[PDB]
Design a protein around this ligand. Sequence first.
Ligand SMILES: OC[C@H]1O[C@@H]2O[C@H]3[C@H](O)[C@@H](O)[C@@H](O[C@H]4[C@H](O)[C@@H](O)[C@@H](O[C@H]5[C@H](O)[C@@H](O)[C@@H](O[C@H]6[C@H](O)[C@@H](O)[C@@H](O[C@H]7[C@H](O)[C@@H](O)[C@@H](O[C@H]1[C@H](O)[C@H]2O)O[C@@H]7CO)O[C@@H]6CO)O[C@@H]5CO)O[C@@H]4CO)O[C@@H]3CO
Ligand SMILES: OC[C@H]1O[C@@H]2O[C@H]3[C@H](O)[C@@H](O)[C@@H](O[C@H]4[C@H](O)[C@@H](O)[C@@H](O[C@H]5[C@H](O)[C@@H](O)[C@@H](O[C@H]6[C@H](O)[C@@H](O)[C@@H](O[C@H]7[C@H](O)[C@@H](O)[C@@H](O[C@H]1[C@H](O)[C@H]2O)O[C@@H]7CO)O[C@@H]6CO)O[C@@H]5CO)O[C@@H]4CO)O[C@@H]3CO
Lengths: 649, 649
Amino acid sequence: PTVVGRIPVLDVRPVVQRGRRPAKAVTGESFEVSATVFREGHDAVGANVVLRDPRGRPGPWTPMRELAPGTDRWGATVTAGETGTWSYTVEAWGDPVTTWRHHARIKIPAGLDTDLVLEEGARLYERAAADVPGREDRRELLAAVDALRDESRPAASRLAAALTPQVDAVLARHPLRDLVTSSDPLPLLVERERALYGAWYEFFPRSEGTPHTPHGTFRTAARRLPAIAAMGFDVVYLPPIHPIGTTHRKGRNNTLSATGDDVGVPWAIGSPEGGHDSIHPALGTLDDFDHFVTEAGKLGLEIALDFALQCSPDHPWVHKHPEWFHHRPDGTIAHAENPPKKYQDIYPIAFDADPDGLATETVRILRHWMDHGVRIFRVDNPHTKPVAFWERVIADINGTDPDVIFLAEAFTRPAMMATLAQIGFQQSYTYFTWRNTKQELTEYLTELSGEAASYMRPNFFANTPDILHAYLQHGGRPAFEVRAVLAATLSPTWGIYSGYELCENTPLREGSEEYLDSEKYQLKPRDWTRAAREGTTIAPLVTRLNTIRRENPALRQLRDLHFHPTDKEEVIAYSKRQGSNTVLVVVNLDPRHTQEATVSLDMPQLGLDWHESVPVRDELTGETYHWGRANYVRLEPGRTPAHVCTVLR
Amino acid sequence: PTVVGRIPVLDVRPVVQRGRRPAKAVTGESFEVSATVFREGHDAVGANVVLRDPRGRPGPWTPMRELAPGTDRWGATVTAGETGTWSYTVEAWGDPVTTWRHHARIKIPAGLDTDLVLEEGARLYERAAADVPGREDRRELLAAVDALRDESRPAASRLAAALTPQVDAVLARHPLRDLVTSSDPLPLLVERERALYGAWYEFFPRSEGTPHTPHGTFRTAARRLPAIAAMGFDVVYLPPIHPIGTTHRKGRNNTLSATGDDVGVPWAIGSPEGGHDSIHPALGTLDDFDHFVTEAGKLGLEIALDFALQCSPDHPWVHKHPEWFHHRPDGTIAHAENPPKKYQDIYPIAFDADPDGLATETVRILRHWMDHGVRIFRVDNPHTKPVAFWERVIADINGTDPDVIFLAEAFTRPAMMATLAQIGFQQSYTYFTWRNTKQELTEYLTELSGEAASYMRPNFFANTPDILHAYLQHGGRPAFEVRAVLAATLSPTWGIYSGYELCENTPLREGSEEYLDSEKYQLKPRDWTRAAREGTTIAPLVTRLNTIRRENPALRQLRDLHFHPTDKEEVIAYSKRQGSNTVLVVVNLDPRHTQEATVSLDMPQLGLDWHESVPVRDELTGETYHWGRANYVRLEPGRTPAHVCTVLR
Ligand SMILES: OC[C@H]1O[C@@H]2O[C@H]3[C@H](O)[C@@H](O)[C@@H](O[C@H]4[C@H](O)[C@@H](O)[C@@H](O[C@H]5[C@H](O)[C@@H](O)[C@@H](O[C@H]6[C@H](O)[C@@H](O)[C@@H](O[C@H]7[C@H](O)[C@@H](O)[C@@H](O[C@H]1[C@H](O)[C@H]2O)O[C@@H]7CO)O[C@@H]6CO)O[C@@H]5CO)O[C@@H]4CO)O[C@@H]3CO
Ligand SMILES: OC[C@H]1O[C@@H]2O[C@H]3[C@H](O)[C@@H](O)[C@@H](O[C@H]4[C@H](O)[C@@H](O)[C@@H](O[C@H]5[C@H](O)[C@@H](O)[C@@H](O[C@H]6[C@H](O)[C@@H](O)[C@@H](O[C@H]7[C@H](O)[C@@H](O)[C@@H](O[C@H]1[C@H](O)[C@H]2O)O[C@@H]7CO)O[C@@H]6CO)O[C@@H]5CO)O[C@@H]4CO)O[C@@H]3CO
């Protein structure tokens, strides 16, 4: 048995881990299946993609084409349907009809062996007809066979009868395929739309309190949901909602020692009041949590809970499961670190003494929150827990509940980030916040929208509680505006952490990416009504960005993205497409100075000719322009961060 | 069961066809095995390559290192021994000692938890000792354990006892490896030296005749072997040695109709006198062929026969096995074509009616020539016969006779050329003759010496009977000289077709790559004695090039090759290394004008510092120079094509 088949079909992509893990898609998403296909000799080959659904049912006829001449690299676009585990195969075959046609077009006007050539064509078309299941189409090919064989007609007329568009049509859907050879099947995991597309908002329920009771409850926090739904968010991400330890608890601004009223850091999970399956008593009860989830659902919001597999020193696990921790020779457990950062309030888990116990307990915890309507988990720092552990835990949850989405908060080196996605994480955080220049954004989004998109789905948080970038610190509100536009239009999933609207940008100290007076360490009441009234919020821009996304399918996918050149370093331009929808975005990356630029569009990449000039509407303002090959733009920070334009007909 | 192991080890290279075919090497050849290796958390990893021989016996301890910081890409050099099918595995592991050392070096001078830290180190070294098989080395580690634990000594002194070079040495050979995780094994086919390294000469025995008998015999042709051995060739490649058809036989200069004395084209195989298992009666008998092989062997020459799986219309197969040919409707067999070229004297084989019959007969033919001492086959135009057919035929021959080498003469698109090598061809012809500028040579040799070298071994024929390049046509003898130097020093296998020495360069017509009066169509007597006497041959340069190769191991491998910049487009410079041997070549690609250039050497790539200046001998002239960072060279066509320098100590 030979590794290569009769008609070579090699290096089918996408492929993840040499076929040991699936390529990814979501319902409705298109991507390209490709292969290297060729044969011996000089005759033509053809190829097609057979996509099989979870019950092994084949998809539609999907013929491939050569992507660039002489490369023998073939491709076709496939579209994922129903969720589940699919497979795809490339079928390669000799294409004797294409070959015969080419020779016949030369030899017949030249008078060379014409009867022999036409009889050869008749024989191919007879064979074509044999594999055609419909009676009417079979008659069309047999009438072509008869015409080809009618020696009473000129040679040119006999040939023309085999080249009619109706004969073409039949052969396009039912070609004659010699020596069909298929690749071994490759696996495709198709997941729900929210895995790829969604707008996220992170906030701390405890901060949304009242004058009488400053520590918010689930009931007070639910009153913030409508303002979040109105900005057009889909997912609400909550920091840990569990009891918080007292031993080594941190104070305000990450001081070592908490005073008596200090609330501590939610990620320092557990006290005698309960662990990862409990509610912080100040937030209320499980029934209050159910009320919160219900009110979320009614406004079109899903809840994403933080899952941080670690413990405060007061978590029950510390005494009940000591082997879940690494102990030094004096019996102490060293607190967690991501140096030079220290987390004195937190003990990390050791996994090598009782891997089974940890997996069992982890999936029980997740299912408990799942039973209370949580179908999305934002997994804290997963790169400090074993990769195979996440692989197991994710396979177990999605095995019974394939709708559950896991987001990996792994800000680390590329290999690890890539592997976590590859072993099951539906979504990943990214380097976005550290990509601010044109060159950085262009290079990074070319990476994420290319081959990486077969295994990673990016979630572009413009900020997090741990990341207030220098760009926002120095640029003020115009920088917040720019970064919202970029995040919302470049990834089908994006997010902000509360206060981003208010352009909160005071760092702990120069050169830091921590916030001063971080919410991680204190209640952070914000006067939302006042901020709305005084117009010192960019909620309206955020709202419009999410509406634009909801109205334009091109913004709800990742893979189709093209950068168009401008003549100013500070002005970036790009387009995204889905079917007839084309969105074209131009952003001034300078938050302090007005920039003017000539944007030169790659017209064929928009589906247009060079001379063509086609109308656009800037959805940020309602204003209409006519744009083609070369366009003047003028963007003033504070008044116009960018144009976000849709193409109309 | 999880796809990723405890310590991730991913994307092991080399890999061919995702592990379905082996990577290649020859006895004595080094190459790099690499992998992506990392772990969770911030502690160090280590890795090593376990090479297993054909009986499953592990090779030596082969620790890998990170190739560039922060990439998590690790590598080590391995060296192939005995021929056969090997395997390689990468083992990844936590490296707790490296981690502990790093922390201990900081914390001990700082006075932080010193007793605890030193006790932790003692415990690692005790564990280290447990897996150490030698008593003396185990004592060295246990003395380090005791020193670490001696609370009567300063903390700095207790630590220094664990960092002694003798403790280092023990741990370098027997490190403490946590959580060892291996990759699945990948296959490696190791073949004999001649698969990679060898100088080849092609000639037509029939042309080396006498005055009485112009058509040479094996006996007259044997008298040419000494002149070939003296030029330092290892392999003699003969065009087909079988009877030649009469029907549609070609005349001189590829005319359609042969006249009565015309000898026809050897590749038009077969007549009633015999087929592929017979000798042309004008060449003599099988016993004469055995004499020829014996005389070859005595001079250090192996014979490579042409194997062209095709037939003249007079080959016995045409009537005895009609299903081995594709017939048109009137019963005729269309002659072979590689358009716009036509081979009216030749019928191609069809493979789809009796694939088994063709494989059986093909291997019988090969074994017959093998029984007569032919262990190398130059396979004619293999890309017009199915890829899986060669896969089968090669697996069958090498299954009993792994020393047999197949050379694929496939001048076609990259996918096919690559696949043929990948499915078993030991050697391939290449694009060399169409790479003549500096940029072309540099780009092409970077491709062949890189990843392609894991599956392809190039054979650089500077010319063939079908390829007289324009560069030789226009450049005359200085161009022949340049191309000999380039071919001989850039690939460990190279070749010429007879008459290249004589600088034969008259084309059929302008714009053609055929020779005028091609040997394919006629006897081509050459007066070798006269050419030697009159000095109108470049045999002496060829001889010296082969001697240089025989004396410098760096020229007998492929993978180590580096191009150094010069300041003239026409002057190329490069170096190759094997252990202590370094060869440095500078060539003037201009055959009409003297070129002067400053060659700027990449010194660290030579194993040297920038300021260093090290002596070289130009092996073409015996002359000695001192070369470093920046060197004046002056190359005059006719007198000095190039410098071929060896580094001495
Ligand atoms: O026939 C049209 C073609 O002819 C002329 O080019 C010469 C050339 O100057 C010579 O060097 C020589 O070519 C060698 C190559 O040097 C050698 O590499 C090999 O070439 C292979 C390529 O390396 C490989 O990529 C592939 O070729 C593909 C290619 O990627 C495609 O882009 C496409 O090529 C077309 C070109 O795009 C187009 O510009 C034009 O080219 C002219 C050329 O300008 C002219 O000066 O047409 C071509 C072909 O239709 O398709 C090819 C697949 O054919 O594989 C090839 C090997 O086939 O081999 C050749 C000679 O053996 O000779 C050519 C012509 O003899
Ligand atoms: O600490 C030394 C380092 O610190 C300063 O850089 C800033 C930088 O200006 C910010 O952008 C930000 O970095 C982000 C990155 O933008 C983001 O991409 C991600 O970075 C990852 C890389 O993308 C990825 O390649 C890998 O990094 C490797 C890297 O390939 C190696 O070459 C090596 O990096 C070293 C550099 O070679 C060396 O120049 C120096 O770098 C300075 C930097 O000049 C300074 O201005 O030291 C580094 C590291 O020792 O090793 C790394 C592996 O760490 O993976 C990284 C992710 O770790 O993430 C960061 C922030 O999350 O912040 C940095 C510092 O915070």
